[PDB]
């Protein structure tokens, strides 16, 4: 493809250059070409992939919500039209990632399998944010199943302070509140996740405790805004 004549190592190098330059579209593109070499990604490579696509899709969601809110207060076809144009681009990026996950990445180490399944649920969540009708809750089921399988693996194979486990549960909680119309389970899981991290705070790791304490603060922040 676009990047198939480039060495995988150079693609990783340039993904990092693009991150320094805040060229997240380029970053995602280099990382996609790297994934497509057919070898698995290290922890650091996994995170370059997630960062790139999160920035790209994050800016698309921010634009969609602007226009969508304008489109609500307005109720000429121009706002619908343009909202729909951004919506269709957002859907294309989600499909790209979801295809990368099912075609190459998901397949491994437990932290690895949780990571990708949490991404599958996340980008199914972003599609759900803009979908409607029969297509919609087909998406919601897809998101839930990806999240559920990831929760089971992380409870079994990861300590309760692990930042992927914590971050997974923060996002599954948000899925419950904002997507599945169940503030109850959202609050329960957020509080269970925090309480259990504190019960076994001795499991924090030299390499990752800063990350865990941050996600734990975010779990409290979501409970504070939901109470």
């Amino acid at each position: 493809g676009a990047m198939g004549s480039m060495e995988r190592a150079s693609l990783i190098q340039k993904a990092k250059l693009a991150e320094q330059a805040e060229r997240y579209e380029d970053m995602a593109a280099f990382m996609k070409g790297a994934v497509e070499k057919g070898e698995e990604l290290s922890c650091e490579e996994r995170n370059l992939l997630s960062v790139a696509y999160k920035n790209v899709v994050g800016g698309q969601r921010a634009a969609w919500r602007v226009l969508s809110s304008i489109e609500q207060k307005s109720n000429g076809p121009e706002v619908r039209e343009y909202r729909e144009k951004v919506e269709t681009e957002l859907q294309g990026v989600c499909d790209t990632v979801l295809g990368l996950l099912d075609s190459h990445l998901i397949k491994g180490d437990a932290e690895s399998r949780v990571f990708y399944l949490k991404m599958k649920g996340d980008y199914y969540r972003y599609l759900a944010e803009v979908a409607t009708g029969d297509d919609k809750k087909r998406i919601i089921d897809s998101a839930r199943s990806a999240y559920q399988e990831a929760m089971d693996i992380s409870k079994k194979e990861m300590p309760p302070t692990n930042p992927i486990r914590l971050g997974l549960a923060l996002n599954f909680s948000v899925f419950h509140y904002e997507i599945a119309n169940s503030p109850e389970e959202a609050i329960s899981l957020a509080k269970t996740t925090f309480d259990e991290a504190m019960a076994d705070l001795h499991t924090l790791s030299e390499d990752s405790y800063k990350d865990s304490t941050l996600i734990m603060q975010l779990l409290r922040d979501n409970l504070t805004l939901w109470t």
């Binding site: 996340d122 971050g167 923060l170 904002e178 996600i215 922040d221 805004l225």
Partner: peptide, 5 residues
């Protein structure tokens, strides 16, 4: 919006 990571 609530926080995600």
């Amino acid at each position: 919006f609530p926080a995600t990571v």
